[PDB]
Symmetry: D3
Subunit: 227 residues, 6 copies
């Protein structure tokens, strides 16, 4: 690996991945005896224990190309189970800020990354691991957290203008928008990794509280990863 | 509707759809007081009761264009919950004939039907309803039936040659191949219908028993539809 | 053959194909000593005589994927000449219901089935056999039938919305819309089959006993051609 | 028009179009009282009479973009019937040099010009006028000329390499390759012009005086069609 | 080569290419002892000397397919440095008629020719040779000519309608529109040829003697570059 | 600004952008009185003085989507001139590690980000600012640095397999591969920003203190340009 310079054996098979290095540092406090196994290029990776299992929390940056690199290198270091925990913008009015979205699929616009990996324009089903996703539903249920299950649109251009953005994607079965799920799911299906994703709603495009929301969700994810 | 000439009120909200008219006729025997509500164009539709609920068994023919027409017309007649029960060819060697595949997603090649409905080439997540799919897992589990959960490739050309067919689609996360799921899932997401799919493995591309397999599975599906 | 379960020699070289199994049965009454050679999966196929010539009438269901399977299997059983006889919706105001359209080509949206067969997105000319199409014209005009010759758009989504549908496809040279011609024409060119298509106008997007008479009359004309 | 500087009334409704300006000059000798109505940008356009009808012979250069400009401008000058008479390379073994191909359709790769005119990547049927094409057949047969009727692949890159070129396109139902057919047909369909095409086989990818005679003989049959 | 019938040794390594055969003839007067080395298919090619260097001026017709054929054949005859000197329509208000645009890149719609050469739909950077382009700038500045440096949109359909044409392409970083740049640049990149382009603004989509002078003055600056 | 949380006036008009936050910090030592204006989400931005000129050094992370967000937000904060300084893998054998490549254009696969910004699949010329790029050349040559000028392929999949990778992209005119240039160039053209790119060759796909010296030396040259 040329980006994640962690020593082999410093990355766990189970990894909770987040886009913000700051969130990785903040969530590492949930682990027992957290150790920083990587700092290169800002991709903070911490490894420690939780519920009797070794677990790692890694930073994936923003966008499909960035998360693809991070997943590929973590996998080369031994990782095979990934659960992305990020922030999203709801596309439907009934979802409130701070609530969660357990992703069942990702819509995406055909693009370079998918073409380079798939070798053609086939719309390969970009879905998470079935079992893993159900365990997440179980963990969030056990902790009495309010969540919704559904597809998300994985956008590549945060600032590109689209006057019909919300209507378009919500009418296509998506309840939220973010930027890395399609890559995570598809690459995982091709590579054989087990992946899933839960998102914290930080904004609603159709319409300290957030801090706690982020922490509560992270605990649910770690429970799932170590279940 | 111009194809399914069923009278309004003759089609239930819950519909089990199969491609073969013969299978529809054969499965109608599982309903209480089955009535033929449509015969036009060979699209046999039967309506009756099961576990205290009105249910319909409809024929959708072969291919996305055919199933799209049938779903659209059944929906115009009141249907909003669809569960496709079909036959498939496994893409992985560990699945045996007669076993079942509970579909979690559908890979497809971009094409006319998807372009006409979506209005562009976006790879909209073609997934079934989460809840419904889990109920299917529950019903097949309760009846001790051997199943596998995973994505399928919805092909449009049964006889088109592809020397690397099995390797290609299996390496893309698909465990089986059929022809209508992608259309069913995507159209359902756009229209707001609740859909799912279970397939009976009749052949394995990587490698009276079938009769019973078909019947046993159908009972599991009807249980799900009326749960 | 996985869908059409007919035996060796039951399927004729020349086949009149229709989408509706009801029409296959109905038209089978125009033949001499018709034999139901297949009914599996609803794909009714009949083989009888017309003008002392053996021919078959087969059901192809709705859509490209469906007709592709049927043609492939019929071909495996001996068929090599196919004339589709179906229903269409006119895209021009001057065409009346019950009249006919003799198809000269088919417009289509790329992808799906075409990509799997062609291996890329090239727009291969989707046209019927020149000779066979001219024989249909002679046959129809001979029976004093009202027909129009032109291209059609082969749609894959009967109910997909398009507020510019009519203007769009008519401005592109298509005079009617149906769903199987592009598949029938392209697959035939690739497999080496002789194909053509005649459509009965059952609706006019630009605008029961009578329609069945229209169907029956055109059927005779088509059968004349398939046995000429 | 900025390329074809002919004045209104100098271009006929009926136009025989050729890619080579040298061919236009050579064929103008078949008209009665031929007059050069344009030479700008090398696009030679002659106008004269034939069989009691006014006809023009125009140069279209090489490629879809070039023929598109020429057709658009001739049309703005009153032209509405076009018959392209070009040269082609056969894709099948049985067609001999000097023989003709009457075109029934054109296969083509999507993109560029087609996207700009059609506004999306739909594979619109690229076919010639049915009536006009049959007349060409009648005229070539009436002059006892050897012709074959079939589709052609309209290539945009004469020199792009493709190892399986001949097999790929012939297996797709095309019997020859050239570069302007698809553009002519599709654009004519969109603009409402009546077009057709006959090609002289100058090479066979599957397998001088005699050629000039071939070119001359075919030109006469085309002119007969244009004036019928 | 089947279009450019010049013999080896008759085409120079350095070639100034223009779309109009009339322009090639007019510019040949700038060379010393100009000799016509080809006129086949109207593609006029002159070869002479300039600044102690042998240079050819060749006609490329209109459109990517046409220029592709000409470049390929000239290259087979020994050419390896090409500078296109054409006419263009400005897409921005501030550029005046008769002024020049030194091209730094070409936007284009995928498909056809690009797909056949590149083998897929990748957006390969369509840029001119860096060194040669800077020399053009130096030469135009040395002759006190008004030029602007920027990208252009290489259109394939001169007459296709697009309501927001000017705003769309100017908002995409293009300052003018023409039809051969993208093909020239990309093909040169693939074949290893050194190419560049200067355009004379003959129209402004955003807003005779004076023009000929403009054309002549720019031709001299281009010839200086080619021989430097 | 959602990611770069800097205040009004902290971000300079001219910005040197790098993908690695470690390099941003390291290079910030070349400035006078450097101030860390942002560290949110790891996107370190420093604003200091160079040759008595205010400039900023910003982190853009890896990939098109990441750099697009950073550029958009920096622009919202006052930035309008961007020079990317990164690392690349040469696609040609004659380029040594530690040497530099001054980018003249970027090849890319269509889709994703480009489709969302451009609204269709047009291959818009992805080029840097002509003037700014020439100043980089002067700056590097002035400091006696070994550089090569050419196009690069902006890949989105660092680890995707392609057994023909090197031959494919080098045959298409690219001399190196990285991941952000196409995005930087196209977005800049659309938004009206002046951009350029210089890359340090850290690997040769066609074949520690030394690399850091290479990085530091080139950084000075780039900073000279941004403050010229």
């Amino acid at each position: 690996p040329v980006h994640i310079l962690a020593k082999k054996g410093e990355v766990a098979e189970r990894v909770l991945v987040v886009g913000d290095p700051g969130r990785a540092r903040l969530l590492s406090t949930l682990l027992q005896n957290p150790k920083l196994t990587n700092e290169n290029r800002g991709f903070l990776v911490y490894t420690g224990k939780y519920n009797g299992e070794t677990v790692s929390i890694a930073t994936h940056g923003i966008g499909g190309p960035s998360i693809a690199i991070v997943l590929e290198e973590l996998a080369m270091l031994g990782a095979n189970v990934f659960i992305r925990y990020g922030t999203t913008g709801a596309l439907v009015p009934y979802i409130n800020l701070g609530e969660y979205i357990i992703v069942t699929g990702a819509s995406y616009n055909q693009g370079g990354l998918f073409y380079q990996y798939l070798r053609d324009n086939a719309c390969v089903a970009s879905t998470p691991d079935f079992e893993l996703t159900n365990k997440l539903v179980t963990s969030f249920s056990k902790r009495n957290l309010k969540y919704y299950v559904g597809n998300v649109f994985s956008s590549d251009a945060f600032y590109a203008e689209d006057e019909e953005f919300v209507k378009k994607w919500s009418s296509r079965g998506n309840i939220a928008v973010e930027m890395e799920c399609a890559t995570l799911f598809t690459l995982s299906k091709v590579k054989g990794w087990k992946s899933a994703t839960v998102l914290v709603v930080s904004d609603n495009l159709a319409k300290e509280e957030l801090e706690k929301s982020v922490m509560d969700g992270a605990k649910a994810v770690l429970d799932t990863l170590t279940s």
